[PDB]
Amino acid sequence: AGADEERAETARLSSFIGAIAIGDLVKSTLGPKGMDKILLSSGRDASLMVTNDGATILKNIGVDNPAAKVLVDMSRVQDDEVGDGTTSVTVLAAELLREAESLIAKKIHPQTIIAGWREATKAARQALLNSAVDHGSDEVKFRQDLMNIAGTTLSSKLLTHHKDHFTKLAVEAVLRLKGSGNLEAIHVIKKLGGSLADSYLDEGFLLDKKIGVNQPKRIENAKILIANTGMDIEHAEKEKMKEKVERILKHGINCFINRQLIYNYPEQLFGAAGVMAIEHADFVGVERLALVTGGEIASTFDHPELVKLGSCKLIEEVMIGEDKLIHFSGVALGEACTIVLRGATQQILDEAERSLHDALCVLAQTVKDSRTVYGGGCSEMLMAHAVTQLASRTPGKEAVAMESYAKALRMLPTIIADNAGYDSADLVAQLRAAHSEGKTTAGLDMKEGTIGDMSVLGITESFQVKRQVLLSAAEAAEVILRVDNIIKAAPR
Amino acid sequence: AGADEERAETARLSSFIGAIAIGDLVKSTLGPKGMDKILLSSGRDASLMVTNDGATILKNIGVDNPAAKVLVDMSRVQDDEVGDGTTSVTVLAAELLREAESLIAKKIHPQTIIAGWREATKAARQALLNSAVDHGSDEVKFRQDLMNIAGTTLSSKLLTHHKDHFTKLAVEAVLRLKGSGNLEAIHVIKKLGGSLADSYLDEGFLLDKKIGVNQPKRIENAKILIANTGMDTAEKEKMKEKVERILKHGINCFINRQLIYNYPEQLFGAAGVMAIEHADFVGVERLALVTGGEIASTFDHPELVKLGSCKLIEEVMIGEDKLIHFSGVALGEACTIVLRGATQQILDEAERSLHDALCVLAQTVKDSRTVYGGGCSEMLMAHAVTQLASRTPGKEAVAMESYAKALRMLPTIIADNAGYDSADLVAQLRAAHSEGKTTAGLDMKEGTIGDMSVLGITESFQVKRQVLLSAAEAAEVILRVDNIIKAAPR
Amino acid sequence: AGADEERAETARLSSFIGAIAIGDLVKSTLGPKGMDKILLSSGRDASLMVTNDGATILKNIGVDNPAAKVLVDMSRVQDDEVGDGTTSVTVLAAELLREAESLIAKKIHPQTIIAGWREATKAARQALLNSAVDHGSDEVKFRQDLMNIAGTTLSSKLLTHHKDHFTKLAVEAVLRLKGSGNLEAIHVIKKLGGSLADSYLDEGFLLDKKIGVNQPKRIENAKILIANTGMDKVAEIEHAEKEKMKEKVERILKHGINCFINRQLIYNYPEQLFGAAGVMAIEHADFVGVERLALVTGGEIASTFDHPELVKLGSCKLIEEVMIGEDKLIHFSGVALGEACTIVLRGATQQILDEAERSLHDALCVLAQTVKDSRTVYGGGCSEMLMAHAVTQLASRTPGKEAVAMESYAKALRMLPTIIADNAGYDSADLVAQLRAAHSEGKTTAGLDMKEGTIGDMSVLGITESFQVKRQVLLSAAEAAEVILRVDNIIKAAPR
Amino acid sequence: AGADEERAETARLSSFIGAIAIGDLVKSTLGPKGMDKILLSSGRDASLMVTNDGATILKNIGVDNPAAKVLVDMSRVQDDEVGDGTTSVTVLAAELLREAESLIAKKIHPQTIIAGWREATKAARQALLNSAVDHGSDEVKFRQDLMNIAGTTLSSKLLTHHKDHFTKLAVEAVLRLKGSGNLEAIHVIKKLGGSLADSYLDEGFLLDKKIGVNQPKRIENAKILIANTGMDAEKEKMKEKVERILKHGINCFINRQLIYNYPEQLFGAAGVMAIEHADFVGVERLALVTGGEIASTFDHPELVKLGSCKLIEEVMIGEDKLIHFSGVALGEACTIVLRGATQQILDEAERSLHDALCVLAQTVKDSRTVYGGGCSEMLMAHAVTQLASRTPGKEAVAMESYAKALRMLPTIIADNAGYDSADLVAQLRAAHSEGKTTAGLDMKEGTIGDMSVLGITESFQVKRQVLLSAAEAAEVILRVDNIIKAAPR
């Protein structure tokens, strides 16, 4: 009873406890019926932060003494190349530690057990495409573009009553995204007001800056000017003023965008002319705009006329249910487009700044991968039936490592059933029988409380989440299990 | 949170902890690789006692706050009609608690789960007699009398070097005592002197006493007199009544259970009669069944109301201690085994094992059925029970599967106390049983798997049927009782 | 603020700790230059008890909570079938625990190693029948009466200088004693003076008492009387006292009474009578001597003054009060029975002369069966080195697991040569290697000669060990100590 | 001062405790079944660092009062000029301290026991000398150059899935440098940019620097100039440098310090490639390669300078620009150079090439190796046990205690395999006694097998350094007189 001082057995437990504590908070977030949580902290925190995405909160806060923060940091790298959907990778790693309890009972070299990871690779061969799956999106694709994985990513997120519609909108954005040059030039801004649609799709670019209170409300047959150099004895200044206007009247210029500080003198002049300019426009938006507007060659005040190409469908500032912004539309190119999101309404609403970035990635993979797997636990039960056989028929050493890996899969069906509110035990017996039969389409239906046809619901998981999780699941852990717990010092 | 008031889920956990703690101490006492343990206490304990037998130590002390004393008390009722062998019933009852963790996931009501226990009855019935119990042990029996179950009882006891030979001797004792209808006339004394044989079998009853330093050494065509009332009590009249009745009978030996009066004693020496003073009553009762008995009352006791055996009564040196031998009983039903041994705590240890060796063998003759030991029975049942869970509809299936799962730990427990990797042992073990060989089991000495029959290890059939149905009913009452509230006695 | 708090590996330590504590006290005792320790306790203890014999002290006291009393109890059975010599069985068992530190390093299954204990069954038995060389003793035996094992038992004792002579004396005591009669009525005492002999042999039983200053110097064809009850117109009553006197003298004369011994106070009137008559009486005689004496004299029925004549059986040879150099003591001697006999050692109130009494009981046991066994082995550790050279071979011979346990047993014999030499006052390191070469060569007689400072001929010295002590020690020790390490953990829980 | 004064048994104990703490952490790290380890520490570490190689972690941190740090420090000297492979030198040294508890029973003085070390030589020498182990290493050798010990050093480390091949490359480097002692002038670098083989072999030395944006890309029949003093009226310095330079035909300038701007303009037009703040370690090694020169003041060019004129150029081999020095006339010194895939594993390759390099140079020249998997150790145990009986008075005590120590090593290897060592300990003993030096513990087998088939051989140097260092440390602290102040610093 009691005692804190780490050597031998105590060493494993600190890592063991860290893994179990995080699993309960993340478990609620999995699949179609996930949950949203709020957190409050003193240092560099304003109020409770509610993030649906597990990865965002783990990076943000280092709450306590036990070791687990380093494991958390690594997940971000995964996010850049795929990331989100639902947070499941951390959970599988945590459950790996649970049978370590059985390891003391084993009473043999813990490190020998590492051969189990090699064994896991054997499991991996068996794991690979043995579980029917779904063929996936051809490229662009009609119906299969969405009403799939994005909805699942959203399911945990607190907005899915109307949000699933929003997700459906997002695949349209990804299809246009491919071809130009991987992923950049994507920007979306949320709106503080609610509507049934809850989102508008723009054919151009969305920006939020204004020259000043004075100037005409809207421009047509717009000409766009982009300058690298700022507009920045007093009589000599007037010459700078005049050159700007002289070149400007001739073109018919409707809008001027400059990436940096804008000199005050021209501003007075623009208002009389009827030309709208933007001060300190961000470079990333501008560069994107150039693709959209046909581009410009930006240099010194010589920049006007022919060296400048400007799209002209329409540039205007449009009131959008509350916070108004400038909309660039009708781009001749058509290659780059912008999405405007409207939120449920709350602190959660501002996540839309970088939420889309997480959203773009799951949809982009679905269209790009051209492969998928069946949703709501369909994949997990089928694989579990196959793995149980494998341990029994491999004699001696080979059998112990494979069997332990196999039971890990059983918990996932239950986690989905438990968040459903239906009985987990009733669910387990019925679930296994349908998968055993051979119907890969059949899966967990939370709404029913019983097993049903997953395909009818339309919930499917993309192919990348299943192959990648399996490859490094057994590689990240092995460096750690090679070790018991840490070297000399007198920690904590 | 954290301070002793318990309700619902917190109440269940205390029961859970008590079961796990007991299993680790008892596990080391299973089969051929079992071990001896010594416990020390202060306050009405005398000091340090060693108990190989799990049941004896558990009954003696209620050590701490967790609740398990009542569960412990039950094992003794089992012991008189079967008991011992090896202690396995407590372990199986304890492991049933582990499934309760999966139970929280079930999250509603554990009670309909109980239906699983009757499902368990099919599993219980299905594999313990399904391999090859054996056929025989019809009566007295030549070779098959031992080098079987007694050895297994001894298996849990390390002393089984010299000791397994001792075990072999015990069945000879059971053949005369067979029936177990009435267990009585068996007396064993350990002797302080080392020898390879370690024990001697006496054709009768062994007792340590002498009249005094006078009186004849040996009697033949012996007549035996036992008196309920003492010789203690004009005095000459008591003397003459005793002599007159005595001479006609030819009285060879007199045994009295209490104080003896001196006047009689002078008489006995000249007469040629050997008398015993303050002989223990329990020996006397056993003796009565043995010699046809007698009615013990006042000095009218001699002649016909008394019956006496006619073979041989003499005092014979045993090792380093002087004892008297009663033998040649006409009845033949009751006889005595005398232990010798090296002499130490262990020699006193044999006292603990006597009332263990005797019970197991008695049961083996009556059941006429047995199962393969060394864990052979346990792995086979596990393979068969896995199929059953899949067959049954749903909720029942969930409960049926969990019971099957528990059998897996036993192969592990035998290997774990043996000295070989538990993980490696399980994989190789299952393949042997799966194949179809009943004889094959766990060979602790080997470190792998082998033929159990060669070693001579078998388990009584009766221990296996009783453990299965009884465990179900006992487990059923604890899940059913959720609220346990108690305070310190006084 | 206290507690016992121990788990898993610490539990192992409790078995470990008991063995180390016992070994340090006993090691000094072993061999020719042994050490004597006095133990004093209060509360159901009297004073100054010092025991040379390791077995006697361990049995008497259960000092503390850790387990060790049970291991101790085993040694007494060994003592019954052969006895002592020097205490060594406990020491070897203790060192077996040291390998367990190695066992954590082993880090597999400590119980698997326990298989070695099974192996020890074979290890102990090859130890048997094999080893030391000697022969037999016929009966009575002139030269071979002693100058053998008693010197060996004594070697542990600080006593062996003048005392080896005392030891020689003890077999004379056994020769008169010999038979299967028992070890009965053997009494030996000590006296406050210094002489080369340092001891004397009394014909039969020693008692420190006298009737009074007056009375005959000695009695012959003596009759011995033992009484349970004590001797304890106005003028006629004084006359009546004389009546008690009358019965005592008139029937005392018919018997021929030469000595009266009473275990209590004695009335003064009879005392005058005994002196004139020629009869020697003893006031407040010790009861323990009396019961023992009765076996010697054939006994008697001790009741009221009716006690004389036939109910009394006195043995007659010589009862006298004799000079023991300083003070004077009375010798019963000449017992017809022959079953019981006595010898006298000299020292008294020295400091530890009472340890001699403790020393004495174990020493007597050694001599009594030397004649009965008729078999012995060479002393001075000659027997121990030879067996040790042989056992190294054995560990290699047994496969796998068995070799580790058998090899440990072999090193146990090595320590004895070192202990014998170390207390001698010579360098232990030099002694061990020179010793091994002589035994290896093939000479059984050669052994450790402490006075020499090197190796010498044991047979000339007169030091031997009973064949029985070596056979039994190897069998019983292995099987009995087997029990101790078969159990790794001894615990329970908590009190408060 | 500090004044921590050591007394008899309380002096010995500090040495005893240090040895036990090190052994448990290092034991799991050994050979094929070797494992990576992580550490979190007080003070300035703030996080968990993972180093497979035991030596790297021990030098970085000096955690507590007893001094084991100095024992630790010694292992690096071994690592730079021989070294690693598997960490066992520290483990064997630690195990000998346990016996000292036994030694108090002996109770004379430690020094008498010290006789064991003369006999450590006789018992052990027989042990190394029990023979086979080393094929012979003829000199260079077509296939025995590797796929042996370097591969095993890598085995404890993960990079081995594709880096076993990298290890193979390293032996080629050692063979060309054989003779005149050992190691000098060996260096290794890694480049970001993937290839399946993951390596490029350079016949010369690899340096990562460039003169500037301008200057000829490739130089031919190059002359090398090394200056002890930096380039840093001003025009006169410019004039002296140009006049001397043209006659020599100087194609490259290497200076170990800061370089002045004026000469730089001249070098581009001249056709001479110069290197700013060149590393001294590369230069000294390079000097053996180019024949060297005496570096003085600008008077230095021509005869007082000796340059090698084969081929110097800066080559784009992938991503980061590097400069290749090639054509060593001496032949005594060469480099190697490594490539990768662009992975964490690749940077680990840098960690183990050093490990591979040191082992082979010593393995080839010493003409000795030992059988791994405990083959050498059990055989050694059998020979030593009879030896104690053989020795006289003062000889027969020290040797006997040393002999039982060897017994533990077979046991440690069997457990890390996972099989029961009890069965293993004497089954193993019977095979060594028989006469097969090639037989030993087979971790993969789970019992005993043929070590030679496995291909695990240990450098003879790794085994001598460990055994001698093992108890010398034990005997020195117990003796310690008039200790002064405290802390290794």
Added chain:
Amino acid sequence: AGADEERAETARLSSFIGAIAIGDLVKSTLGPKGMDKILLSSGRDASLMVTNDGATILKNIGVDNPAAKVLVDM
């Protein structure tokens, strides 16, 4: 008992409490005989604002640990 530690079901109660706490202040305002509330805040606030309009006051301040700010914004 004795602590403010809360999880899952007890956790729900804090959400529960926020809704009840807001209702008592607002109810007085809801009709033809309302009260009037002032609310003075210390730290980066300009004077105490006394508001009879319930919507205006809930939006202006995020007073404490319990969560109700998000309900208010809509």
